[PDB]
Structures are given as structure tokens and as C-alpha cells.
């Protein structure tokens, strides 16, 4: 509360460390469904159904331009990528499996780096 603060967690490396995680996600072999925004002209149903599209390139541009206020808003956009994928893709499809694999990969790096 006013003039009563928990001890200051060192957040000065967060930007660099989110960048490193994001590099590891970009270079994973199963990243291909997520590298670029879904083409809303060419994929029927996507525009109407997925209210907030997100992809790794969009996250990379937001990261690079100071549009994440803190590491939690960064994790929210990564998770959005996988939540969108589960909304639109069957679990038993290549893209559906890719999304589960990537979410797992991300969540481990996140825990190991920050928890």
C-alpha cells in the first residue's frame, strides 16, 4: 500500500531473457504454423472466429519496440498464440500437435528462467 512495498525483484534482465526464449521458440522445428500472421484473406473462418490473432513475428516486433510493459504481458501473448491454435485446429492434426508441443516447450523455459 502507500509507502509499504515488498522487496524490489530485479527485472533489469527480463527483456533480454524474453528475447532469448522467443529466439528458442522461433527456431523450434514445430514453430512453422506460428511464425507469421494467419492470412485472413486466405483462411476461411479465421477472421470471424479468432478475435485476437497473435503470432511469433508480431510478438517479436512488440518486444523490440517496447510494447510489453512487463514479462507477464509477454507470456499472455505467447499463450494467446497456443489458445488460438487450439480453438481452430483439431488436436489430431499436424498444426494441433505443433501447438501442444510448443506450449509445453514454452512453459518449461518460462518456469526454468523465472520461477
- The domain that holds 1 is classified in CATH as 1.20.920.10
Cβ–Cβ contacts within 10 Å for residue 52, how many? 8
Give the total number of structural domains in the chain.
1
Show the domain range for 99.
1-115
Radius of gyration, alpha carbons of the chain: 16
Dihedral angle, C-alpha 109, 65, 56, 25, nearest 10 °? -30
Deposited resolution, Å: 1.8
Displacement of CA 112 from its chain's centroid (Å):
16
Amino acid at each position: 500500500s502507500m509507502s509499504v512495498k515488498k522487496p524490489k525483484r530485479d527485472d533489469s534482465k527480463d527483456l533480454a531473457l524474453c528475447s532469448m526464449i522467443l529466439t528458442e521458440m522461433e527456431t523450434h522445428e514445430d514453430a512453422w504454423p506460428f511464425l507469421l500472421p494467419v492470412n485472413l484473406k486466405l483462411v476461411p473462418g479465421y477472421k470471424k472466429v479468432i478475435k485476437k490473432p497473435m503470432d511469433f513475428s508480431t510478438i517479436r516486433e512488440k518486444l523490440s519496440s517496447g510494447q510489453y510493459p512487463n514479462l507477464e504481458t509477454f507470456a499472455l501473448d505467447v499463450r494467446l498464440v497456443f489458445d488460438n491454435c487450439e480453438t481452430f485446429n483439431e488436436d489430431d492434426s499436424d498444426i494441433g500437435r505443433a501447438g501442444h508441443n510448443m506450449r509445453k516447450y514454452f512453459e518449461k523455459k518460462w518456469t526454468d528462467t523465472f520461477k
